[PDB]
Design a protein around this ligand. Structure first.
Ligand SMILES: Nc1nc2c(ncn2[C@@H]2O[C@H](COP(=O)(O)OP(=O)(O)O)[C@@H](O)[C@H]2O)c(=O)[nH]1
Ligand SMILES: Nc1nc2c(ncn2[C@@H]2O[C@H](COP(=O)(O)OP(=O)(O)O)[C@@H](O)[C@H]2O)c(=O)[nH]1
Ligand SMILES: [Mg+2]
Ligand SMILES: [Mg+2]
Lengths: 177, 175
């Protein structure tokens, strides 16, 4: 009953905080590690209990260089972007998919919109306005998930604790095959 | 944008009515065929419309049924809540067959006729053979022994859970 998850995506898109809120239940306000230490989550699906190992990744000198070594013996990949950063969504299609297809190909991919709480925030809307950009819409997000062939598209906010459980329960359902 | 689903399970467990209610929108009371005509449903997932081909099966049917398995993406193994025997056959008959012919595919275990779980006449009939309607726990346990992708319960008669069954199968079929 054991499975492995790897989470990847642009720096600062919210990967580590998402794992921490799911695992520990509280958003980390001051200290955030670069990568969440490996942890085994208990996830209940259809009455069954599976242990899900959470493998966080980064792009910081050596963490970037070592990241391909996380994919072996994986069962599900989370590709993340931040709703307040359309640039991080462009890299989902540009950089991250190319990596997963190079290293994994046959694993299910969940596409995860992180920081969903920033979607309607005026300060972000004004900043993105300057380049004629907007926070990512569910439409655009679901559209990129299809383009990259993902298993599911999900949105979440670590900060408000919205949608976090659904990400990991879904990812676990995909991992069980 | 196309996927194929095959539905299997004991005769009269509710396979054909489930497809008709999902496809056509009305529970079939006048005419019910042994197997529904092959039909392609539109199912929306994550904003995407996918065409889901529905392949009904029966038991000159116990022998021709394997010709439905090629090119499937998802299998529904069905039983009826008012028939624990049909749940017993999931493992004794149906799981070995789908793995013999398909092996690669996600499997959903689907409790059908869920509207009968609390029907008094049903409960008394099963009492006479020391049985009771299948519980959620009893179904989930078989879904576990079967390594199934999902366990779902539904009632075609009343429509509870029907949409969710086919939306889940489509999500599974995209693997
Ligand atoms: N508004 C908002 N900010 C977030 C959320 N999750 C993370 N952040 C912030 O994004 C920054 C980077 O987050 P982090 O988890 O370290 O991103 P990572 O590099 O992918 O691990 C930090 O300042 C977090 O406080 C969220 O759900 N909402
Ligand atoms: N109570 C109840 N009866 C049902 C339901 N679905 C089918 N039936 C009945 O089960 C019998 C056989 O149904 P059918 O769809 O032909 O089962 P199949 O042999 O698996 O194709 C018929 O009398 C149906 O009306 C349901 O959801 N609830
Ligand atoms: Mg990080
Ligand atoms: Mg029939």
């Amino acid at each position: 009953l054991r499975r492995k998850l790897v989470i990847v995506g642009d720096g600062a898109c919210g990967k580590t905080c998402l794992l921490i809120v799911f695992s520990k239940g509280t958003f980390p306000e001051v200290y955030v590690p670069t990568v969440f230490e490996n942890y085994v989550a208990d996830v209940e699906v259809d009455g069954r209990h599976v242990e899900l190992a959470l493998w966080d990744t980064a792009g910081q000198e050596d963490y970037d260089r070592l990241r391909p070594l996380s994919y072996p013996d994986s069962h599900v990949i989370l590709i993340c972007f931040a709703v307040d950063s359309p640039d991080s969504l462009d890299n989902v299609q540009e950089k991250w998919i190319s990596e997963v297809l190079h290293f994994c190909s046959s694993l299910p991919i969940l596409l995860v919109a992180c920081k969903a709480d920033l979607r309607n925030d005026p300060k972000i809307i004004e900043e993105l306005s300057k380049t004629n950009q907007h926070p990512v819409t569910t439409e655009e997000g679901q559209a990129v998930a299809q383009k990259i062939g993902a298993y599911k598209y999900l949105e979440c906010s670590a900060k408000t604790n919205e949608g976090v459980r659904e990400v990991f329960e879904s990812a676990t359902r995909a991992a069980m095959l």
